[PDB]
Amino acid sequence: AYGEGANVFGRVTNKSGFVPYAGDSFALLLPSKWNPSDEKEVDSIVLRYADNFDAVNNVYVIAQDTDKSSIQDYGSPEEFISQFGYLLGRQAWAGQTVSEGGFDANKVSSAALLGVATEKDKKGKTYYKFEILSRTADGNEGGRHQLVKATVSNGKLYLLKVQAGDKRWFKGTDKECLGVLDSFTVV
Amino acid sequence: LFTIKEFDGKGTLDSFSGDFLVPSYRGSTFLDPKGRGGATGYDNAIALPAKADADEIQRLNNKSYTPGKGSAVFSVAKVDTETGEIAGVFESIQPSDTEMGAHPAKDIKITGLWYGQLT
Amino acid sequence: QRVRTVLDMDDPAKEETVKELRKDINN
Amino acid sequence: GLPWYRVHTVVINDPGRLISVHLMHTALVAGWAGAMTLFEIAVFDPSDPVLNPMWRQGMFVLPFLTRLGVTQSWGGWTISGETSSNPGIWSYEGAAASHIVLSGLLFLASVWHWVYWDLELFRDPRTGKTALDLPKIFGIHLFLAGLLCFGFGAFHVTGVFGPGIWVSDPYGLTGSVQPVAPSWGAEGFDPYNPGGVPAHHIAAGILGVLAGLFHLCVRPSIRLYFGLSMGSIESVLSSSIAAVFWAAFVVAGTMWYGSAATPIELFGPTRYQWDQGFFQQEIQKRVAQSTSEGLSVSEAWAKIPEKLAFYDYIGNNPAKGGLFRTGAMNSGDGIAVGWLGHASFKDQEGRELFVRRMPTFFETFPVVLIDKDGVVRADVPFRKAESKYSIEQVGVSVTFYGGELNGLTFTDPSTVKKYARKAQLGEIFEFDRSTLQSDGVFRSSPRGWFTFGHLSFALLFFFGHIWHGSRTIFRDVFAGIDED
Ligand code: CLA
Ligand code: CLA
Ligand code: CLA
Ligand code: CLA
Ligand code: CLA
Ligand code: CLA
Ligand code: CLA
Ligand SMILES: CCCCCCCCCCCCCCCC(=O)OC[C@H](COP(=O)(O)OC[C@@H](O)CO)OC(=O)CCCCCCCCCCCCCCC
Ligand SMILES: CC1=C(/C=C/C(C)=C/C=C/C(C)=C/C=C/C=C(C)/C=C/C=C(C)/C=C/C2=C(C)CCCC2(C)C)C(C)(C)CCC1
Ligand SMILES: CC1=C(/C=C/C(C)=C/C=C/C(C)=C/C=C/C=C(C)/C=C/C=C(C)/C=C/C2=C(C)CCCC2(C)C)C(C)(C)CCC1
């Protein structure tokens, strides 16, 4: 019964499609429609959001712990991403299958590394940024695009992974996924 | 799956015989009418919450997609040497689908013609 | 004896248990 | 002539043949009770009251015999697993035979009343026309019903002269037929208090006797006589059908939600005991106790009774059956022949995981293993590719405590998956399915079948009450309107 007036003819609210989230020692932009989720597929996850439509489009921030002084000590972007294949998800199939079609041998999952790049930031931070297309034998949603932005700060390895469906990707979740990706600042 | 892939035929112009791979008829992501599969599936009959047991391990607890082998003999006749093309007849024997390991395979004998161009 | 432990142990198996549904305004 | 749906109207104005058809109906119902008892005795297996109780065997009237005191058989066995050396006349077969004899006697009385219908008792002494003084008859019947209700509550269920009624512990472990003291306070209106039954029957019998005396004495008023049509037997039929479906709704709700008069040892557990974690909570509290006292986990799970473990199992849920899944629950999932023990799940990291139990709605439910803090840590995935929580990836082992697998630990995923899928249904048991050729699909409990039958009868009787109230109020236009 606390009297507060309604917003009639009150112009607009924030319709930017993004909300600012400041976690512990990082700040990033989340999609406006995505709900937070308590799921932690990696035990060193400090943040997770998922789309109200489907939980295929998700995003998480790994904090973890590292011993290298900088992510540049991981050799290269390719050598850095070769060590995080468990982010993809282990293939639980154990039978030999050469009848899946363009999937090598006994494989029902594949990861095409579309691009590797190095992005250096205003504060001196350098980020490794990764486009990966993971595709399965059934090929759910035409494959899933993974967006990784990682750097080493303090004494920990901050990593951002954004997962989207390819059907969602050409539907128009590519814009919001890249907006999440390009807003990851750790310092 | 009438297939000839990876056929390694040794022999003569009159007849050369060899083996070829016969892939599984269904992929591992194929789902049975009860939604049991290989790469996907429920792994058991879930419409029967107290029946999906070890006496039907062939149907639900295991799904097999092992590739097989097939034999083929080819014979060459009617060769055009000015256009570099060859005709002939072929004789193949290959196994059938094993569902997904639920039944033994039958043997199919395929006779027919074949054609090719060289270089 | 530890009602909090038995509560947090019945909860993941069944969220509709009356121990979880009772006096949880304090939680 | 008459439509086929009006034949029984030929006894509306024939009190003797109305008595005759009532007597025939009573004979048929008593004969059904006796024959059903003999069928259930012939097919009942009493050798294991713990893991094969009567509600696992499709027994419908056997619980109603056991509820009021009949607990022994002429076959030398007691329903509580003891030995009956002198069952007496009032055994299960004795009650069955008494009902058969009663059915025969009522058949003979029905024949007599059909033949000798033209009794001067049914003639009004003033005009000589056939009539029934329905207010006076209701007074007599209400007086008799009050006397019988008072006697049943003051002598049978109190144990003063009768045997008492079935009373159990809250968790259905140590139930027996006991005398019951009346509860005259507010606790007497506790539905689960057994003491409410004698107090209700004593008080309601006294009130029925007083109201029957009132209806014997005081004639109805002319206004209310014409308003309710107390000269027409069809008005009495409509009001009786109304009262009967009211009672049917009451007994259906009481059986479905449980009460002191519907014990779980006789009718099976209720669905709300599974929904609200009744037996699960009791089992876990009994395990938490004696762990603080200083016992290991291998014991204090062997201390858990197999009866309680069987109660904590969704296959005993009355709301997990089907409309055309017929017969005993044993014909559904086998005869339970042993508790395998509690299954504790752990991952490679050593944290304890619990299988998410299947809710009552779900015919099928995904297997999900959740940690202490509510985070899903493992599952049996539908998509075994790019998965992150499979049993193989997480490294889940299972250890059993207290049962036939006590002390055993399984680490292979093929067996961890099946034990997690079984733990989805609650406590894990071994079932003999070859004896009855069980089809592996859950059946319904006798309380569920009772509730379904009585709710359906209650709605159909609501329609019948509407139809007969309509017939009473609109009798003069039953064949048509006046046209003027
Ligand atoms: C078993 C109990 C019982 C029954 C079946 C009756 C039956 C009778 N009583 Mg009654 N009576 C009794 C006990 C009983 N009495 C007791 C305990 C007392 C106190 C001593 C009396 C004292 C009494 C008096 C003083 C009189 C009657 C009379 C009557 C007659 C007409 C009733 C009438 O007009 O209904 C009313 C008409 C109705 C249609 C009632 C229908 C009920 C409602 C509408 C159902 C609605 C349900 C709805 C969905 C809401 C549910 C909500 C929920 C919370 C309840 C009838 C023969 C009268 C008579 O002629 O007797 C000589 C009379 O005047 N009775
Ligand atoms: C209030 C009524 C009632 C209730 C609740 C029960 C309940 C029970 N009886 Mg029972 N019984 C009853 C009256 C009742 N009975 C009577 C009147 C008889 C005499 C005919 C029987 C004879 C009887 C036998 C002989 C047996 C049972 C058994 C059973 C148990 C198994 C479940 C079941 O009913 O089968 C499943 C019930 C159904 C599938 C109900 C059918 C649904 C409706 C009626 C269908 C609609 C009509 C439809 C148009 C018919 C067309 C079909 C046609 C094409 C063939 C259950 C505890 C069994 C048991 O376990 O014995 C120990 C058993 O073998 N009872
Ligand atoms: C209406 C309420 C009612 C109900 C349904 C029950 C039900 C029960 N009572 Mg009872 N009881 C009640 C009221 C009730 N009682 C009251 C008012 C009293 C106080 C008097 C008691 C005191 C009590 C005692 C003292 C005992 C019970 C017991 C029993 C049980 C078996 C006896 C029985 O009824 O068999 C069903 C009976 C019939 C179907 C009647 C059969 C009629 C026969 C066959 C006809 C006559 C035969 C004969 C040959 C006729 C020709 C005569 C010719 C030879 C001259 C049964 C569960 C007994 C027990 O403990 O059981 C283990 C027992 O010993 N009751
Ligand atoms: C010393 C006093 C005493 C004691 C201790 C009791 C104790 C008891 N009486 Mg009571 N009673 C007494 C004297 C006493 N009575 C007297 C003097 C009378 C008058 C004769 C009655 C008349 C009476 C009635 C008529 C009822 C009881 C009931 C009960 C039980 C209440 C708990 C329960 O299970 O309710 C559970 C029952 C209810 C809560 C009834 C709810 C009915 C609702 C309002 C309507 C249901 C039908 C409706 C049309 C819905 C249709 C379907 C819907 C989906 C549309 C308990 C055994 C009830 C009983 O037998 O329960 C099994 C009951 O129905 N008593
Ligand atoms: C001497 C006679 C006698 C006795 C004592 C028995 C004894 C028994 N019969 Mg019964 N029975 C008999 C006659 C008898 N019967 C006759 C005449 C018939 C034909 C109608 C039957 C048909 C019958 C069947 C259908 C069944 C039995 C069953 C039973 C057993 C349990 C009874 C029970 O659960 O009560 C439960 C009884 C009630 C809950 C009735 C309560 C009365 C209602 C509430 C009255 C409501 C209206 C009332 C006028 C309101 C009063 C108002 C108030 C103010 C006073 C028991 C062995 C059962 C069993 O297990 O058999 C194997 C069962 O299924 N009997
Ligand atoms: C105890 C309650 C009761 C009683 C005493 C009556 C009595 C009467 N009804 Mg009925 N009625 C009731 C309940 C009751 N009804 C209910 C519950 C329904 C709704 C389903 C109705 C709806 C109704 C209608 C719509 C009609 C009547 C009519 C009649 C009259 C003739 C019936 C006849 O010849 O049927 C003859 C029936 C047959 C030859 C075969 C019926 C076979 C049925 C469909 C299946 C078998 C039943 C089975 C054997 C019994 C077990 C079920 C039981 C547990 C209930 C008679 C006065 C008629 C009337 O008013 O006439 C003027 C009329 O038209 N009734
Ligand atoms: C759709 C429902 C409905 C309909 C339209 C009928 C129709 C009929 N009833 Mg009734 N009746 C009903 C259901 C119904 N009844 C139910 C559920 C009961 C209880 C068992 C009865 C009990 C009853 C008796 C015993 C008799 C009839 C009779 C009759 C006839 C005369 C009209 C009358 O007295 O109305 C009855 C009046 C009502 C149904 C209105 C009830 C309104 C109540 C008081 C509201 C109370 C609300 C209150 C706040 C409680 C809220 C509870 C909540 C918290 C859960 C007529 C054919 C009488 C007759 O003359 O038949 C020939 C008769 O003898 N009725
Ligand atoms: C213990 C075992 C007991 C055994 C059971 C015995 C009873 C079995 C028979 C009872 C019912 C008989 C019904 C006769 C039917 C009958 O008598 O004929 C029609 C009947 C005739 O009414 P009248 O008053 O005009 O009849 C005069 C006399 O000739 C009839 O007695 O009308 C009715 O009211 C009855 C029901 C409505 C009729 C419609 C119901 C049928 C529709 C079926 C639809 C199917 C198509 C589906 C397509 C999707
Ligand atoms: C004569 C005589 C005698 C004998 C008797 C007898 C032998 C009886 C019986 C009887 C009987 C033995 C009975 C029974 C019965 C039954 C009934 C009556 C039933 C029924 C049914 C119904 C009604 C049902 C229906 C249904 C169905 C079908 C299914 C489901 C659904 C329903 C439920 C609806 C003596 C010597 C004693 C004495 C002298 C005389
Ligand atoms: C004689 C006489 C009379 C008449 C009466 C009547 C009319 C009666 C009736 C009756 C009736 C009306 C009866 C009925 C019955 C029924 C029964 C007896 C039944 C049954 C059933 C069963 C046994 C079942 C089986 C089964 C099952 C188990 C389930 C389902 C299916 C089947 C079928 C398989 C009068 C009164 C006039 C007079 C006096 C004398």
XYZ file of N, CA and C in Angstrom, chain A residues 64-141:
234
model
N 39.535 -19.916 -11.362
C 40.563 -20.964 -11.258
C 41.789 -20.422 -10.514
N 42.967 -20.913 -10.892
C 44.240 -20.545 -10.294
C 45.328 -20.953 -11.275
N 46.354 -20.116 -11.405
C 47.426 -20.375 -12.353
C 48.764 -20.011 -11.727
N 49.830 -20.598 -12.277
C 51.183 -20.344 -11.806
C 52.010 -19.495 -12.757
N 51.610 -19.388 -14.020
C 52.324 -18.546 -14.967
C 52.123 -17.074 -14.626
N 53.159 -16.275 -14.896
C 53.071 -14.839 -14.654
C 52.035 -14.187 -15.562
N 51.968 -14.617 -16.820
C 51.018 -14.062 -17.770
C 50.547 -15.167 -18.703
N 49.406 -14.921 -19.352
C 48.866 -15.879 -20.312
C 49.777 -16.023 -21.524
N 50.634 -15.026 -21.779
C 51.654 -15.143 -22.817
C 52.615 -16.287 -22.524
N 52.755 -16.669 -21.252
C 53.584 -17.812 -20.892
C 52.990 -19.139 -21.347
N 51.747 -19.152 -21.826
C 51.155 -20.369 -22.366
C 51.588 -20.651 -23.801
N 52.666 -20.023 -24.265
C 53.219 -20.304 -25.574
C 52.565 -19.522 -26.691
N 51.311 -19.845 -26.978
C 50.587 -19.253 -28.094
C 49.101 -19.451 -27.842
N 48.238 -18.757 -28.593
C 46.797 -19.046 -28.494
C 46.431 -20.500 -28.768
N 47.058 -21.131 -29.763
C 46.730 -22.520 -30.074
C 47.160 -23.460 -28.951
N 48.355 -23.249 -28.391
C 48.791 -24.058 -27.260
C 47.979 -23.772 -26.006
N 47.406 -22.572 -25.889
C 46.544 -22.276 -24.751
C 45.195 -22.974 -24.876
N 44.639 -23.034 -26.088
C 43.338 -23.680 -26.255
C 43.458 -25.197 -26.362
N 44.642 -25.727 -26.671
C 44.801 -27.175 -26.693
C 44.714 -27.809 -25.309
N 44.761 -27.015 -24.240
C 44.760 -27.529 -22.878
C 43.404 -27.413 -22.194
N 42.368 -26.963 -22.903
C 41.058 -26.763 -22.294
C 39.966 -27.515 -23.044
N 40.327 -28.633 -23.682
C 39.358 -29.435 -24.409
C 38.252 -30.003 -23.544
N 38.488 -30.128 -22.234
C 37.445 -30.577 -21.321
C 36.312 -29.567 -21.196
N 36.537 -28.313 -21.599
C 35.433 -27.364 -21.698
C 34.430 -27.797 -22.758
N 34.894 -28.531 -23.770
C 34.015 -29.011 -24.830
C 32.993 -30.009 -24.296
N 33.436 -30.931 -23.449
C 32.581 -32.004 -22.983
C 33.040 -33.349 -23.507
N 33.353 -34.269 -22.599
C 33.931 -35.549 -22.989
C 32.921 -36.404 -23.745
N 33.391 -37.042 -24.815
C 32.563 -37.975 -25.568
C 32.370 -39.250 -24.756
N 31.132 -39.513 -24.348
C 30.821 -40.664 -23.513
C 30.503 -41.913 -24.324
N 30.602 -41.840 -25.647
C 30.400 -43.011 -26.484
C 31.690 -43.812 -26.603
N 31.570 -45.132 -26.465
C 32.727 -46.013 -26.418
C 32.743 -47.070 -27.513
N 31.748 -47.098 -28.393
C 31.708 -48.054 -29.487
C 32.310 -47.458 -30.747
N 32.940 -48.311 -31.549
C 33.546 -47.847 -32.788
C 32.469 -47.553 -33.827
N 32.538 -46.361 -34.422
C 31.548 -45.906 -35.394
C 32.271 -45.192 -36.527
N 32.355 -45.838 -37.684
C 32.819 -45.188 -38.900
C 31.646 -44.869 -39.826
N 30.429 -44.845 -39.282
C 29.217 -44.612 -40.055
C 28.486 -43.358 -39.588
N 29.231 -42.347 -39.144
C 28.630 -41.084 -38.741
C 28.739 -40.003 -39.806
N 29.719 -40.096 -40.697
C 29.797 -39.200 -41.833
C 30.637 -37.975 -41.553
N 31.833 -37.925 -42.132
C 32.740 -36.813 -41.891
C 33.119 -36.636 -40.436
N 33.339 -37.738 -39.721
C 33.660 -37.686 -38.298
C 34.786 -38.652 -37.963
N 35.765 -38.763 -38.867
C 37.005 -39.507 -38.655
C 36.768 -40.977 -38.323
N 37.012 -41.355 -37.069
C 36.865 -42.744 -36.643
C 36.563 -42.756 -35.155
N 35.486 -43.443 -34.769
C 35.000 -43.567 -33.395
C 34.631 -42.228 -32.769
N 34.489 -41.175 -33.570
C 34.240 -39.833 -33.073
C 32.824 -39.400 -33.420
N 32.139 -38.819 -32.438
C 30.841 -38.196 -32.638
C 30.864 -36.720 -32.270
N 32.049 -36.157 -32.049
C 32.207 -34.744 -31.749
C 33.458 -34.229 -32.444
N 33.409 -32.967 -32.861
C 34.533 -32.339 -33.537
C 34.570 -30.867 -33.165
N 35.772 -30.299 -33.166
C 35.977 -28.892 -32.845
C 36.811 -28.257 -33.946
N 36.184 -27.406 -34.751
C 36.894 -26.624 -35.751
C 37.261 -25.279 -35.140
N 38.557 -24.999 -35.065
C 39.052 -23.738 -34.523
C 38.980 -22.694 -35.628
N 37.921 -21.879 -35.613
C 37.705 -20.928 -36.697
C 38.720 -19.794 -36.669
N 39.189 -19.408 -35.487
C 40.151 -18.329 -35.403
C 40.797 -18.145 -34.046
N 42.054 -17.710 -34.053
C 42.792 -17.356 -32.849
C 43.305 -15.933 -33.010
N 43.250 -15.163 -31.927
C 43.676 -13.773 -31.978
C 44.153 -13.339 -30.601
N 44.974 -12.293 -30.594
C 45.487 -11.690 -29.373
C 44.972 -10.262 -29.282
N 44.341 -9.930 -28.159
C 43.756 -8.613 -27.948
C 44.368 -8.000 -26.700
N 45.067 -6.882 -26.870
C 45.657 -6.160 -25.753
C 44.768 -4.974 -25.395
N 44.720 -4.651 -24.106
C 43.713 -3.766 -23.539
C 44.385 -2.484 -23.038
N 43.553 -1.533 -22.593
C 44.038 -0.224 -22.162
C 44.960 -0.328 -20.954
N 44.603 -1.160 -19.976
C 45.353 -1.260 -18.729
C 46.643 -2.059 -18.863
N 46.969 -2.545 -20.058
C 48.092 -3.435 -20.249
C 47.721 -4.897 -20.314
N 46.454 -5.232 -20.083
C 46.012 -6.615 -20.145
C 45.997 -7.106 -21.587
N 46.434 -8.345 -21.784
C 46.406 -9.001 -23.083
C 45.481 -10.205 -23.002
N 44.557 -10.306 -23.953
C 43.531 -11.338 -23.949
C 43.707 -12.273 -25.137
N 43.457 -13.558 -24.906
C 43.372 -14.544 -25.974
C 41.900 -14.778 -26.290
N 41.540 -14.666 -27.571
C 40.146 -14.649 -28.000
C 39.928 -15.670 -29.109
N 38.949 -16.553 -28.911
C 38.834 -17.823 -29.619
C 37.417 -18.021 -30.135
N 37.292 -18.250 -31.442
C 36.064 -18.721 -32.082
C 36.231 -20.207 -32.379
N 35.390 -21.047 -31.776
C 35.441 -22.491 -31.999
C 34.042 -22.977 -32.349
N 33.924 -23.778 -33.399
C 32.650 -24.390 -33.752
C 32.726 -25.874 -33.414
N 31.943 -26.299 -32.429
C 31.858 -27.700 -32.050
C 30.620 -28.311 -32.687
N 30.800 -29.443 -33.354
C 29.715 -30.099 -34.066
C 29.664 -31.569 -33.684
N 28.453 -32.101 -33.568
C 28.243 -33.476 -33.146
C 27.641 -34.288 -34.286
N 27.612 -35.609 -34.090
C 27.094 -36.504 -35.120
C 25.608 -36.270 -35.364
N 24.833 -36.057 -34.299
C 23.466 -35.591 -34.493
C 23.444 -34.128 -34.916
N 24.388 -33.328 -34.426
C 24.533 -31.953 -34.865
C 23.480 -31.012 -34.321
N 23.281 -31.043 -33.000
C 22.252 -30.239 -32.349
C 22.413 -28.762 -32.671
N 21.310 -28.153 -33.113
C 21.249 -26.738 -33.478
C 22.280 -26.384 -34.547
